[PDB]
Amino acid sequence: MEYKDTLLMPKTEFPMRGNLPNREPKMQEQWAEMNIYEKVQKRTEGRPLFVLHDGPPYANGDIGMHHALNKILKDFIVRYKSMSGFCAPYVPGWDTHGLPIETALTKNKKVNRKEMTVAEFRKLCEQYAWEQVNGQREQFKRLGVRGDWDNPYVTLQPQYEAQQIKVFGDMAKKGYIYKGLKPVYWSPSSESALAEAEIEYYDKRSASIYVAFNVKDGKGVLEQDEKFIIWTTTPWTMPANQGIAVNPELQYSVVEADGAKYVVATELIETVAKEIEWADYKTLRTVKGSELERVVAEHPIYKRDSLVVLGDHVTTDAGTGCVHTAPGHGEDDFIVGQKYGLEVLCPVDSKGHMTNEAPGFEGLFYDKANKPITDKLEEEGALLKLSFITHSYPHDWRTKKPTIFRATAQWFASIKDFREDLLKAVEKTKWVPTWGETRLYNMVRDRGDWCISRQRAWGVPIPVFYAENEEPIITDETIEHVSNLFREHGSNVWFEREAKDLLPEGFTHEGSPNGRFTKETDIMDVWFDSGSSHQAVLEEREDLQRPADLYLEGSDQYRGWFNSSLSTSVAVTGEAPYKGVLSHGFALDGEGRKMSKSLGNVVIPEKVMKQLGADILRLWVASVDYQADVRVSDNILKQVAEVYRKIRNTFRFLLGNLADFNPTTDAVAVEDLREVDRYMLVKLNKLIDKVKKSYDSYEFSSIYHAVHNFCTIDMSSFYLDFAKDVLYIEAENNVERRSIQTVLYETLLSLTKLVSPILSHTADEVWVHIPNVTEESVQLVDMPEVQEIEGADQLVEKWDAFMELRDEVLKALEQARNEKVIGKSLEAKLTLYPTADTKELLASISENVGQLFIVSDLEVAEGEAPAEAQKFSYASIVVSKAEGEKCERCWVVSPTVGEDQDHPTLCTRCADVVKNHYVQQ
Ligand SMILES: CC[C@H](C)[C@H](N)C(=O)NS(=O)(=O)NC[C@H]1O[C@@H](n2cnc3c(N)ncnc32)[C@H](O)[C@@H]1O
Ligand SMILES: CC[C@H](C)[C@H](N)C(=O)NS(=O)(=O)NC[C@H]1O[C@@H](n2cnc3c(N)ncnc32)[C@H](O)[C@@H]1O
Ligand SMILES: [Cl-]
Ligand SMILES: [Cl-]
Ligand SMILES: [Cl-]
Ligand SMILES: [Cl-]
Ligand SMILES: [Li+]
Ligand SMILES: [Li+]
Ligand code: NA
Ligand code: NA
Ligand code: NA
Ligand code: NA
Numbered sequence: 001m002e003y004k005d006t007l008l009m010p011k012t013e014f015p016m017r018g019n020l021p022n023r024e025p026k027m028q029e030q031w032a033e034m035n036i037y038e039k040v041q042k043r044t045e046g047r048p049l050f051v052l053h054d055g056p057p058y059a060n061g062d063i064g065m066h067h068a069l070n071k072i073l074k075d076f077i078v079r080y081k082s083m084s085g086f087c088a089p090y091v092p093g094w095d096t097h098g099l100p101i102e103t104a105l106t107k108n109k110k111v112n113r114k115e116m117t118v119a120e121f122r123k124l125c126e127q128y129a130w131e132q133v134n135g136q137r138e139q140f141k142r143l144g145v146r147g148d149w150d151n152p153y154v155t156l157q158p159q160y161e162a163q164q165i166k167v168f169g170d171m172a173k174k175g176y177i178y179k180g181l182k183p184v185y186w187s188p189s190s191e192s193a194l195a196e197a198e199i200e201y202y203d204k205r206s207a208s209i210y211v212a213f214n215v216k217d218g219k220g221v222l223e224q225d226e227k228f229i230i231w232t233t234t235p236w237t238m239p240a241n242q243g244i245a246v247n248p249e250l251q252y253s254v255v256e257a258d259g260a261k262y263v264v265a266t267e268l269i270e271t272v273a274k275e276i277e278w279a280d281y282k283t284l285r286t287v288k289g290s291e292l293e294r295v296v297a298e299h300p301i302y303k304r305d306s307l308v309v310l311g312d313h314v315t316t317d318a319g320t321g322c323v324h325t326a327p328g329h330g331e332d333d334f335i336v337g338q339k340y341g342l343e344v345l346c347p348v349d350s351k352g353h354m355t356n357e358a359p360g361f362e363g364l365f366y367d368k369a370n371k372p373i374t375d376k377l378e379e380e381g382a383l384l385k386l387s388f389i390t391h392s393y394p395h396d397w398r399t400k401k402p403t404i405f406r407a408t409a410q411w412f413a414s415i416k417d418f419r420e421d422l423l424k425a426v427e428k429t430k431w432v433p434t435w436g437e438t439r440l441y442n443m444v445r446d447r448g449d450w451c452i453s454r455q456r457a458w459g460v461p462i463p464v465f466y467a468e469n470e471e472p473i474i475t476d477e478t479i480e481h482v483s484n485l486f487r488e489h490g491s492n493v494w495f496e497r498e499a500k501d502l503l504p505e506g507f508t509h510e511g512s513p514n515g516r517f518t519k520e521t522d523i524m525d526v527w528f529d530s531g532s533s534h535q536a537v538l539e540e541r542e543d544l545q546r547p548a549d550l551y552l553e554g555s556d557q558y559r560g561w562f563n564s565s566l567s568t569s570v571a572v573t574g575e576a577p578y579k580g581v582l583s584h585g586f587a588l589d590g591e592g593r594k595m596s597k598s599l600g601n602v603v604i605p606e607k608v609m610k611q612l613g614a615d616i617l618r619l620w621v622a623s624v625d626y627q628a629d630v631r632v633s634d635n636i637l638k639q640v641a642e643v644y645r646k647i648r649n650t651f652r653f654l655l656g657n658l659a660d661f662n663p664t665t666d667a668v669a670v671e672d673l674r675e676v677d678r679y680m681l682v683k684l685n686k687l688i689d690k691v692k693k694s695y696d697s698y699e700f701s702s703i704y705h706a707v708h709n710f711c712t713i714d715m716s717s718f719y720l721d722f723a724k725d726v727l728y729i730e731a732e733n734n735v736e737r738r739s740i741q742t743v744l745y746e747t748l749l750s751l752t753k754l755v756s757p758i759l760s761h762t763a764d765e766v767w768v769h770i771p772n773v774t775e776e777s778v779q780l781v782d783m784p785e786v787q788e789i790e791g792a793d794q795l796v797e798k799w800d801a802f803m804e805l806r807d808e809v810l811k812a813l814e815q816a817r818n819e820k821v822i823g824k825s826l827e828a829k830l831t832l833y834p835t836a837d838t839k840e841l842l843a844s845i846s847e848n849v850g851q852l853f854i855v856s857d858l859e860v861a862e863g864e865a866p867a868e869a870q871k872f873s874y875a876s877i878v879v880s881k882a883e884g885e886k887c888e889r890c891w892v893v894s895p896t897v898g899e900d901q902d903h904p905t906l907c908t909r910c911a912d913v914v915k916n917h918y919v920q921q
């Protein structure tokens, strides 16, 4: 009414309280209308490419917090590269085959794969897959991610399957593919073989056994009264035992008597005494381990032959220097078994039940047969001690049930034949974090061959044919024929055609004179499907190239996508499929616990997406060290939401005070700016350089705190706090108010372009309220390039000290606020007694110290009388009342109020502004 004369914050087109959940979906609607991803791609069509290949997430179900972090971090890098001189094509993917889909249907939808045909079950997997890829893609958009969502890649597409066969064919012609009977992971629950990437370790209770092996033919070294000692945590492997292993040269064994003479390593006398609980024991003689070679023993239950063999695998750390050798259930047992030509026995079927090869335990599940085996051992008297231990045990990654080693005929990729080239690729790759290099390097030098065949249906079949010779037929013509056939009809054709209909039209092989061929039924590892992405996406698609610039996935992908993609590429190309790798940790509860439904700590993305929004989650991603494990909770997200409030209010302050500003020609020159404003320009450019550098180094935690510090204390509390009472009161064409606005305009333009990769819904919302809009969205302009400011270093030293001094003045004002008598910074006059250094800085102030300290008046004298007021380490201060007339417009207590006849209640400053007008109004 009468007490106010406008001069407030006009531009409220950007609301204060951020209702992003109801506003962001509309923001994404316009993004889809304009096809912004195609626009930015077209704008940079000639710029150099930065390819961030997207790791294909599984379609097992809805998205989680971990799914968001992987996509959001990818979105940060792609958006920055788009507006920094690079062309950034990002095509999303989805891994569609393998157990993660079959187990989802079996458990969630209660469908039995054995109650329907193989073709029918595959069709249901295909239907459930496209349901999940549609649901996941919409959820990713809600978070806010830019990519080729309408043209993604999936592993079920015929082009992907066709190219995957080529990858197998290229490695096969190199000789890197072979088939053999070897012990490998077997999951009885899934009735299929597995690999380390498909193995999850959990603690499991197992029965420790110390058992006796009678001596039959000591070869002049041992008498029949001696007995071997064997330690085993797998009783079910005893029926398959074909030998005993002991170290030939390093370890020497001795005979110990406790009423009977036993054979054990000398270094394990005390350890085996406390385990079997021996009372009194004595050592008879010593024997070098190599002397015990070819000694024949007897099976405790079947009294069959068991041959003592030499091996480097037997260790002192075991419970006994003698380890029972079962070539059909162990890797090291198989190697020494083949050296001595020992028979391979696997009395366990695919479902985990003992077969006729174990006479007394046929039909029993291997874990259910442990007790009967021990009972028979004690009946035979060969059992010495029975104990129980808990240790980490391999489990199926989907059924969560334990796995066992089984010696079966499987397809393998000969890693050993090109392991050296794999190690070279790791050394030549840039790994962030740095330990990722050693993580994969050790995984390569210690890895065996890769078992690729899986006894399941939903996946890409192995393209191998067998003649009447039963010889595997792998050749370029067959691979070419099946690859093109898969490109036309898909992998489904292999499961619906005879063997002769999948081969070339006139193919004949020497092994089958009658032309009767047969095909293979096993399928490929789902990690091979994801590992073939570089050939099927980076190479086939024109929008991408190989090698990609960056691979950004989780820590579990070192054994997964990182390993498989490198394995396939180096086998074919010899080089890495990526120039660099970035790794993120695991999402965790606020207390550090794993996010699982059992703990009730699950943070659903859609839950936060509707309670808080998208950019709040985007801020949280940049607020954590993604390179390690990251903690998330509702309270933590609320803290990030509070940060967005500060960013919201500071942005609104910039927009509000820039309403009556048009920098088309009202731009104050750099020299014409106030020295206070020039320092803020240097700080803005320093912030620009730090953010762009941190984007190159992917350190988003630095960016998150830098912007928060740049606004909470530097801008809102220091620079905007002063201009909160100065900008509008003065003239609308005053150089001071225009110079301050030019700083605010440049910060608004630069900061909006800076935050564009991290926050985009709020960035474009602010970009709407921009006086100069030459591009539709902030994502269409490049990042602000840093510009040097003359005399920056001198001003930085001067004004940082001035910023330091102001905070001490404010603390003195807050000390007056503690008194609360004046209770106002502007209504307070000041009498300052400064240090010579402080006085020198005040002398260097060519601006108005009173308006900077938002005080009515300031006087400086060397009074040096502390009294009882205050003294900062650089000045003595007196906060005094002015006692003049308070201006009704600027609220400054000034003696000049009443000097103007037309406006007797206004000071000279306000009276002049009200009376005069520049050109208008
Ligand atoms: C699938 C069955 C569960 C694991 C069940 N809770 C269970 O068996 N629990 S346990 O504590 O008995 N597991 C001990 C492990 O050792 C085997 N075992 C148990 N009792 C004996 C025994 N007397 N002699 C030999 N082996 C034995 C079990 O099979 C299990 O692997
Ligand atoms: C590149 C993806 C792999 C080829 C595989 N399909 C896969 O892991 N698919 S996923 O859907 O399970 N996960 C996709 C991404 O999320 C990471 N991830 C999976 N689980 C977690 C977790 N608990 N915490 C943090 N990150 C996790 C994966 O490493 C991958 O980057
Ligand atoms: Cl099943
Ligand atoms: Cl063992
Ligand atoms: Cl047919
Ligand atoms: Cl067939
Ligand atoms: Li025990
Ligand atoms: Li709060
Ligand atoms: Na059924
Ligand atoms: Na099969
Ligand atoms: Na077969
Ligand atoms: Na995984």
Ligand SMILES: [Zn+2]
Pocket (backbone or CB within 6 Å): 887, 888, 889, 890, 891, 892, 906, 907, 908, 909, 910, 911
């Ligand atoms: Zn006034």
